[PDB]
Design a protein around this ligand. Sequence first.
Ligand SMILES: OC[C@H]1O[C@@H](O[C@@H]2[C@@H](O)[C@H](O)[C@@H](CO)O[C@H]2O)[C@H](O)[C@@H](O)[C@@H]1O
Ligand SMILES: [Ca+2]
Length: 1113
Amino acid sequence: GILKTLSAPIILENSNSTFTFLPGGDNFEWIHESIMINAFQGNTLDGSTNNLYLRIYKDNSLAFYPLIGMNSKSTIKSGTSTLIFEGTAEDISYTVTFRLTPYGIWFWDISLSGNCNKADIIYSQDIGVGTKGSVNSNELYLAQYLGHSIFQGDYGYVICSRQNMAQGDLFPYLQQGSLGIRSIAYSTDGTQFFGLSYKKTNIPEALYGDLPSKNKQYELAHTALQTEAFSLSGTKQFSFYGICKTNHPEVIREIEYIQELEKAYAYHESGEILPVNVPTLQNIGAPYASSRWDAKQVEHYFPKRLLEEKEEEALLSFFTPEKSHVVLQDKELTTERPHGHILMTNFDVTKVPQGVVSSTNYMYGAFNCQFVVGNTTYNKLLSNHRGLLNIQKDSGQRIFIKIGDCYRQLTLPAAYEMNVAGSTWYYQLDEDVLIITSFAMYNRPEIVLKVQSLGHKKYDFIVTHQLTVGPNEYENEIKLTREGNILQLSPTDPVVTNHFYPELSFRMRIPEDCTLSDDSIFFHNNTTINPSLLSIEILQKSSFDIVMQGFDTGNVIPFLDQYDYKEQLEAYRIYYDQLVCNFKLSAPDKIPLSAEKLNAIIHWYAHDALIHFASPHGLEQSGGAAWGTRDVCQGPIEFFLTTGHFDLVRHILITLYSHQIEGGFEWPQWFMFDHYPIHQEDCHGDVVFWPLKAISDYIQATGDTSILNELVDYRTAKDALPTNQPETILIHIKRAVTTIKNRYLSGTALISYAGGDWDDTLQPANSELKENLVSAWTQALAEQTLELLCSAIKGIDHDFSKELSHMANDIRTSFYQYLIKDGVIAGFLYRESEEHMKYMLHPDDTESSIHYRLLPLTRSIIAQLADFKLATRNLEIIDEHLACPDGVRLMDHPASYSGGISKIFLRAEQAANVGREISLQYVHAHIRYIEALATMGLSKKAWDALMRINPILLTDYVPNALTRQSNVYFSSSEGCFDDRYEYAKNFDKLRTGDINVKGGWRLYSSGPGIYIRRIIADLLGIRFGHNVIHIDPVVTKELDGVTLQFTCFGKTVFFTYHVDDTMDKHICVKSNNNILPGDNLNNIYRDGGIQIAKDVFLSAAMSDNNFHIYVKN
Ligand SMILES: OC[C@H]1O[C@@H](O[C@@H]2[C@@H](O)[C@H](O)[C@@H](CO)O[C@H]2O)[C@H](O)[C@@H](O)[C@@H]1O
Ligand SMILES: [Ca+2]
């Protein structure tokens, strides 16, 4: 059985423009040359995101009617470049004429006839303004770089947008406005038009009032324009228009293309314009959102609640003793980002896994998106989640339920409960509760949907599945076979998946009495439009399930007879416990809140980190699949080193070293770690150090110098194929270090910036910057890394170890000689020669608004590179110029923004949106600040810093922080600034907490792993070494009397902290009152902790596993 692909049947063409529509006239793909103008493709059930709304004002009501798309009930005529919608709203007759002209200009001509006292129109248009691949890859990201400029033309507001992130080499542009009627108000983001309330009501919030007339630069690029209100008695006519320019290299300064628009306006197609058949929804109602639960209901279903978050006495969220996090409906309506979750199947934690099964879900009834087996991009069954507000609500697995006459799509539940093993949705129905559960099987490549009516009441359902079977929906045909209640799905030949995973298939077990169709069953006349929407109609049932299996290599297994959530929950609980070494903080009296939060969060962060590693994708950042080179060296390796998963790390390192590129002998920016030969051979300048650092850390932690003699291949730059000319990892290392020697600016050991450093938004804007910039952070990391490498290699190759020492000394010397002035480490040096040198991100750069950088300041402490006095200074700089209530910032002022053109840094100066790194509080870098504080023993700052970025009860800790999902990592914290200009002007609000701040992209980050390492290794102070344990806590008096349960070398022990500032020594460890012998650790900033031998430590733990740690902070 072959499922055909959706093709938009309405195809408008003119010149270099192809605009396609679904049968009801919903935007599908609007292409001008190589630029996609819309942000979202319409789908056959919801239609598209754009519309034109007629509003009617009366004495006792406001009404609002969409005029286009499947939801208008318009009849439709088409020609080759023209679309004509016709219908009535109340007693107003309308016609809307869409004209696609030859000039990369389009019109919506509106004509209204009838009698009414007061009406207006709202124009609504989602805009991508990138290549097709850019749009599909990540709409949110693309929108962040689309800068809007607002002008008054002859007919009120006109919206001009420039895409600042290069598309090919082009910077595309849009203009939108009105003709023959004044646009009296405008908005530029989806959150302004639809609002958060949409996620419940399914009605765009702006429809009830006036547009705000503010440009909000956020992630839903969405233009709206509101006409002046008018009377009708007879006929009135007017237009909206758009203009696309594929390349607008200048910044936007005024309204352009006035004469071209006037010309285009006069354009009409000669041909006939003929009726087309419009399929119409049959017995499909509006979506169904649950009613909200009251306190009695919450109490009944969740009698045991922890860490309750309340606002205005409404319960928003809480955690449970079962390690779940529960979200109530009201919270979702306040959070800009949608609550969500990623399921992932367990794997053998001694090896880099393959074929891991993953699924994503969200609270507003996206039960299962991006079902994948192995590769998260290509080995996929269900389409990705897109957007933020669930306008387009088709993705992945969706559920309709019949209520009265009508099937209604489930959206927002009363409550949403996440566990590491699954998600559960509770919908309140009339005198019933429907429980939906989507969950991972333990030891099996499966996700399971279960639906249960609590009162055993029977309902009718349609479960839809937007199939991919391949990377994307609507690309390729799909093989579908059925045997009884088992479907098997596999990719057809053209699909890339087919080439590298030829045996890949999915299977679905469906309910015994169900009927199978495509979208045909939704329409009055049974017309298939989207043949790859797999629909399962299930009649008069009080429960059912659908079980989804994935087989990347075709190892098909039979379905179990019963699929039990509770058993998986228990198994995943133990799996995660073991992953974190049975981490548990306890105390006899009330545990401190900080410890209570750590116990709550640590397995969530473990889960996040484990996804980042094994099934790499995020919520917003859905497109991943690859390992990032620096990424895998940080979150995953640091997590695994911290918890003793040394075999896994060894394997990760061998896999990583195999991906070093032949010839250049650096690493790609990122690479697939499966059979897809795909990588990005161009890299940032910092990337070469990470694998060097990580291997040194592994060697130091395990003593496993054998990893250096392993024979490991390389990859070719263009093809990403094995070179089949392996060498020892030692020789890999040598070749990588040669590249580093070649980075020296002549006459120095200053490392050239090259492709950039850690901050992916600070890529050099030209080749002079690439050659003559020096990042002080990079310099520091290079020193750190070469010293670590020196030590790891000292026993194996004396001569190379000696050379590494020299190099490190030279780099160190250059760092102190060039990059420090007046006690301040410069962010950057620009050096043409000894005679022409200048600082950036240093107080000496008086022309600049930017005078301090965080990164060099932390790294130089972490590396023990900064002498005690310099380090001390670094901290004072942070305190005075970088520290904010939401954490430490990356620089003391934003990067330049002047309409989107880059002068020094690329994406930092192009981002229209205040978010991500541009927010200047990127959490990962804050976590490094924590590491530096721990290095210095500054326990009160370190623990306060730890809590500032902890999502559990964040709003109580950081009063200007806006609430966000509490059981997932947030990557950034950004001021609620609508544009870069306001951001620059009122930046100081961030220091004082006089602006609100909101959370960034979730889950996918090295942050969760490196946070874990901060908690356990740096602060609680339990670290593993070659047949030794290091105890070096940096704790506050608040942890006095608190105990950590932790499994060490396979033995569970209990570390009880005693914080005694009156002791004559720094640290003392006891078991059964016997003092444990050991050596003191090296630390230039403070007294170090203690190194105890493994044999000694274990011998003590066998007789008494309660270790008492006496420390003086
Ligand atoms: O997706 C937007 C973000 O991309 C980050 O770089 C990603 C990296 O996180 C990922 O591990 C690899 C492999 O999928 O792809 C890179 O493009 C940048 O650091 C961010 O600035 C950007 O927001
Ligand atoms: Ca105490």
